[PDB]
Curated annotation (Swiss-Prot), chains A, B:
GO terms for cellular component: periplasmic space. Its main location: periplasm. InterPro entries: 9HemeCytC (IPR054980), Cyt_c_III (IPR002322), Cyt_c_III_dom (IPR020942), Multihaem_cyt_sf (IPR036280). It holds the Pfam family Cytochrom_CIII. Keywords: Electron transport, Heme, Iron, Metal-binding, Periplasm, Repeat, Signal, Transport. Heme 4 binds at C111, C114, H115, H218. This is Nine-heme cytochrome c.
Amino acid sequence: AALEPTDSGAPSAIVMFPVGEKPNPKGAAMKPVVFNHLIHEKKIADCETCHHTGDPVSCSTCHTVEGKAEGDYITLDRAMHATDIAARAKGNTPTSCVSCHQSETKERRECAGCHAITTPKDDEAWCATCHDITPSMTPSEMQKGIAGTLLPGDNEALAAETVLAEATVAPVSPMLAPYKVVIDALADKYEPSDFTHRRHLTSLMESIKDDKLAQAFHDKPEILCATCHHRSPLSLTPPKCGSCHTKEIDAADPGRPNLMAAYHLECMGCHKGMAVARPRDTDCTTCHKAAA
Amino acid sequence: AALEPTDSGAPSAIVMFPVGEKPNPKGAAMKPVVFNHLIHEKKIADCETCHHTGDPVSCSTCHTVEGKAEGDYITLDRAMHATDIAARAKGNTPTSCVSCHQSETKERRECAGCHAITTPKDDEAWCATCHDITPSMTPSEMQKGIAGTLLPGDNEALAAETVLAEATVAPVSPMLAPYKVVIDALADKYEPSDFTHRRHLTSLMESIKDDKLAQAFHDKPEILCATCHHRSPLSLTPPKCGSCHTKEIDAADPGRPNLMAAYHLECMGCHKGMAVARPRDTDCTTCHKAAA
Ligand code: HEM
Ligand code: HEM
Ligand code: HEM
Ligand code: HEM
Ligand code: HEM
Ligand code: HEM
Ligand code: HEM
Ligand code: HEM
Ligand code: HEM
Ligand code: HEM
Ligand code: HEM
Ligand code: HEM
Ligand code: HEM
Ligand code: HEM
């Protein structure tokens, strides 16, 4: 039942609390975050990538909710979520939880296709992927974590309970969505684009099927459908692109591409993102045969 | 079952479908919208405010999904959700669903205080407030609604079943939130501000307790807490403002107010929005007495 021990001597899993000096008797705070150090140290080889100062200590020893000189007044909020971290001319460039994860999406070919075109969503389910404590923690325990007085045994117990109770959401099967879609809304100079809908989603899914970071944040069964079917409720029958993207110019919606450009930008955007060899963006017949 | 017949003669409630010419055999679309004509016409005096062309005919006779000349190519999506509609110098300026509802939040003092400072949120739960059809509608009926061959009695039956299954979420009691809060995060030149938390919420809630539009859209029990406790999961114990808002301007987040401006902008923002006589924004000591 015990969690697997780390090689490092860090706790296998640890509950991270909103550490600060301002009294917070009512526990006004996000849910604490249980961090799975085991999983992370197996994947990220350099301890100092994260522990950027070289010190094997809790980030909140320096980055408290309100900020303290040891962390150059960089707060807990900033240290955990910062998306725009400047490269340090000298020494280590720190990482945040959010910044490293986002990097994975851009630098790994299997992730960078979809993540070239996704409509970012940082909603409650996004926060909850990390702000994820077991319901068994009491207010009193929340207070001891804030105060640094929780005993390491209780931190372990809460952490283990939480990790043991996590479950990975399974993405809906590509069989529940079209096998192909004959995109013919605009057909004129070319024949329809016979989009291999199932072939596409199956392939994209297969390359990430065991990735623990994707599995944790792809956390609704239909969520991958939003990669293309964006800005509408998750659904097995989403609205057509052309319900929101007009064929002609739409100056009342300056940010929305017209329908041809919508297909081109989205289809070619992923192809570029994940370096798809064929079709190239300059290939004007592989996606749609020339009309008679 | 059947609904209350209207004075106008329109069906008491009407299912609105994604009407257009292009085949949609799989019903790729949002859920149809059940519009409560009865409730609307009892509140809105002039038929022409909505039926801007003067004749009470379905909007999608002119505003199809793809658009067409009889609607000046303004699509069904633009006609229902348009937010930035130009005032017409000749005749009736059209309204959309969204635009009139937004006007309500702005032009009515009981709505305009919170709505001067809320963090706008057009998420799935917002969409579903209107895209709200009974689960009993079958794909075949959806096809007939799209094609305009659904029998009027069938439309009626679907709308009545939908309306009669509607649920209003009750907002949590202000007794579940603090009576008063000593706001002392920044205490220095002034004493802490002893904010009348419960009196504020209770008062704001009292004034909208019977409003059907607010009731539909305020659709999570803790949603009203988000008026002030924004950008975090709905919670009875949200994070402190100062967990995200730093004491001094952070150059890393230069559009995020610092903590003092966070309080001032929020507190004075609603006060201005709903024409609160006192405190004026210059009545400093009213919100925080000078420090002895
Ligand atoms: C989602 C948008 C989200 C929000 C909101 C959020 C807020 C936030 C706050 C305000 C803090 C500071 C402490 C407090 O409770 O006031 C906090 C701290 C941590 N966060 Fe967070 N956070 C959200 C998103 C996420 C995501 C997606 C992750 C993981 C990648 C994450 C991580 C952390 C960690 C770690 C902490 C410190 C521990 C704690 O104080 O709970 N956050 N977050
Ligand atoms: C490399 C193998 C490595 C070491 C060693 C290490 C140590 C370490 C310790 C001793 C702790 C506990 C500190 C405390 O005083 O409680 C700890 C905690 C955290 N670590 Fe770590 N760690 C190593 C690797 C990494 C890597 C690669 C990551 C980033 C992906 C990382 C992150 C963290 C975090 C976050 C914590 C929790 C701090 C808290 O607030 O509880 N570690 N680490
Ligand atoms: C714990 C593993 C930990 C995290 C995570 C963390 C993150 C972090 C961020 C993202 C920054 C950069 C912020 C920016 O806006 O540029 C940052 C910067 C500093 N930190 Fe840190 N940090 C972690 C832990 C610790 C430790 C334990 C301390 C104190 C010993 C600390 C200190 C600092 C300071 C100082 C800086 C500034 C460095 C710079 O080059 O500006 N961090 N941290
Ligand atoms: C590749 C293994 C991969 C990673 C890693 C990954 C991570 C990831 C995160 C962390 C999120 C949350 C939002 C954020 O950027 O922090 C996220 C969200 C979505 N992803 Fe993803 N993802 C990877 C791969 C893929 C693939 C192959 C697809 C397309 C099929 C995909 C799409 C999605 C979508 C949709 C979301 C939600 C919207 C968003 O916030 O981007 N991801 N992913
Ligand atoms: C995720 C599993 C998902 C589902 C569900 C889904 C459904 C869906 C339907 C029902 C159609 C309509 C077909 C018709 O007109 O009869 C459709 C059409 C398109 N899809 Fe899709 N789809 C899902 C996933 C994805 C993904 C991840 C992408 C992009 C890689 C994608 C793309 C498209 C496109 C393009 C179309 C055509 C829409 C149009 O031309 O209006 N879908 N999908
Ligand atoms: C159908 C699968 C479809 C495609 C294709 C499509 C593409 C598309 C692109 C390339 C953009 C620009 C980049 C981006 O994602 O921001 C874009 C922009 C918006 N879309 Fe779209 N879109 C598809 C479907 C839909 C649907 C069904 C809607 C309406 C519910 C919708 C709406 C929007 C909007 C809004 C934006 C603009 C965002 C902004 O920058 O202001 N799209 N889409
Ligand atoms: C090569 C650069 C290229 C050209 C040229 C091109 C043109 C084009 C037109 C004019 C349309 C409108 C429909 C018509 O038949 O006139 C059209 C629409 C689609 N395209 Fe395209 N297109 C070029 C390249 C690409 C590539 C590489 C892709 C696939 C990644 C692609 C896809 C699409 C799709 C989908 C549509 C919609 C088809 C329809 O609605 O009939 N195009 N393109
Ligand atoms: C929430 C952001 C939301 C989305 C997304 C959205 C989309 C949408 C589309 C794409 C259409 C056109 C037809 C289609 O199904 O393809 C459509 C049509 C209607 N809408 Fe809508 N809609 C969203 C939000 C809302 C809300 C909050 C309202 C009510 C104020 C509303 C209303 C309607 C109406 C009425 C229609 C016409 C009937 C229909 O086609 O279902 N929408 N919407
Ligand atoms: C004023 C008292 C008034 C009249 C009269 C009126 C009539 C009416 C009819 C007869 C219908 C049905 C149309 C059809 O052919 O199916 C209808 C439908 C809608 N109405 Fe209406 N209506 C009057 C008042 C108003 C008011 C003030 C509004 C806006 C708040 C409103 C809106 C609508 C809408 C929307 C519908 C449904 C149209 C659809 O596409 O199905 N009406 N009305
Ligand atoms: C457009 C077709 C449209 C839709 C859809 C829509 C929806 C809607 C709902 C879901 C509510 C809540 C109560 C109910 O279920 O009926 C509601 C309430 C009112 N609305 Fe509305 N509404 C649409 C159109 C419009 C228009 C064009 C206006 C103003 C001209 C408007 C106004 C209002 C009013 C006011 C209310 C509350 C009525 C009350 O009894 O207090 N709506 N609407
Ligand atoms: C006054 C009677 C009033 C109305 C009307 C109203 C409407 C309303 C709607 C239509 C929404 C959905 C979002 C949109 O703008 O379309 C919405 C959302 C929220 N409201 Fe509201 N609301 C009225 C009053 C009040 C009052 C007095 C408060 C504060 C106590 C309040 C709060 C909010 C919150 C928060 C939201 C969600 C976030 C957002 O989308 O604004 N409203 N309301
Ligand atoms: C009147 C023009 C005015 C001034 C001046 C003023 C300044 C002020 C300061 C300097 C702060 C920091 C706290 C301190 O004690 O130094 C501060 C804080 C808050 N204020 Fe203020 N303020 C003025 C006006 C207003 C008004 C009219 C309100 C109420 C509507 C108000 C609100 C607040 C609150 C709340 C805070 C935080 C208090 C704390 O954390 O100690 N102020 N203000
Ligand atoms: C909705 C019912 C709601 C809840 C729940 C909520 C709770 C709450 C908490 C627990 C506190 C912390 C108090 C403490 O630390 O002693 C708190 C504090 C403040 N709130 Fe609140 N609150 C709810 C709603 C509202 C509303 C609608 C507003 C704005 C009108 C509001 C305001 C605030 C403010 C300001 C504070 C102080 C926060 C700080 O100084 O960090 N709340 N609330
Ligand atoms: C923000 C923390 C904030 C402060 C501080 C504050 C104070 C304040 C004073 C001192 C009064 C007069 C007496 C009283 O306590 O009622 C006053 C009254 C009203 N306020 Fe206020 N106010 C703060 C915030 C807000 C917010 C964010 C709103 C609207 C969402 C709001 C509204 C009101 C109302 C209305 C009044 C008048 C009395 C009533 O009818 O309840 N306040 N506030």
